[PDB]
Symmetry: C3
């Protein structure tokens, strides 16, 4: 129902798609090759800038295949993409394995899931 | 409450329950004994298949106790269970301690939390606002 | 909009703030200087107690800065803070780096994000509906 405006800023940028009508999220594909050493983090670029309908955020979520088979995950999962973030989407990927992990161009390395936001007003009590 | 059709497919499978009335999530219990060595990751069957009412997902979340005391967590936390997934629920547990971690039949190793979903419609743009 | 009642229970405690009107979460600030050894976890106190309006939970999420530059994250991210919890907000911070990581009084170490709750009722059956 909700709307996300999207700008490609890299030749390899892809418009994320839902696999099925029941998918919670959409696959995010790398636009560049990144080597990630054992026991370290890399920043993987997605080559897209998003504008989300007010009232919504994006969660950037670890893919389970990569987690189970290479101990690779989104280190800040669920990574927060704020409604007012307009820069490039990038995934912080950790390699918790003893083996190197190559992110090739096109690789699905995270998922984007749209969620509604709810802003809190704080009311201080000496209670 | 929204509804979840559940089928047990292991004798040891358990209908998940909210510990309190105020709980966000329901507890997921292992059916198989699994050992998870240091700095590695194992897969824990729960022996259930879910069908969630339409327009909802289930996030599989790390229990805070296990994380704090044993450095164990759901590696894909929050693990996405899509509305239309009908296969067995399983939890990818990682072990970041320099020690063995043992999963025993009936051990609660994660939390399922239910959430509404929202579908984006992408609109391509030369330039944003 | 929803209401959170907050009680400070530590002198260094800060009422969390949203950086902007578009922010998903408010920053959680430590009240104690603590050192977290490499490849270990630490329970970091925020020195605040929360009453969330009925129907909302809180998520405690890793800050992206600390993850990328220090391999520091919230080990149970997203940390479930249930609606009926009136204790001290504490953050389970892991240091996955091979370096000591110092938390200082006032440091932003996680983000709390209000989400709305949904309880399931389980109906058991013999066979489920099919999909693709």
């Amino acid at each position: 129902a909700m709307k996300i405006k999207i700008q490609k800023i890299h030749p390899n940028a892809l418009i994320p798609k839902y696999q099925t009508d029941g998918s919670s999220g959409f696959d995010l594909h790398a636009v560049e090759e990144v080597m990630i050493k054992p026991h370290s983090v890399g920043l993987v670029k997605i080559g897209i800038c998003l504008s989300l309908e007010v009232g919504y955020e994006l969660q950037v979520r670890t893919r389970s295949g990569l987690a189970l088979n290479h101990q690779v995950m989104v280190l800040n999962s669920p990574g927060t993409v704020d409604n007012d973030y307009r820069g490039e989407i990038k995934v912080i990927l950790a390699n918790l394995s003893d083996k190197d992990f190559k992110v090739q161009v096109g690789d699905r390395i995270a998922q984007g899931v749209v969620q509604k936001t709810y802003k809190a007003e704080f009311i201080e009590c000496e209670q």
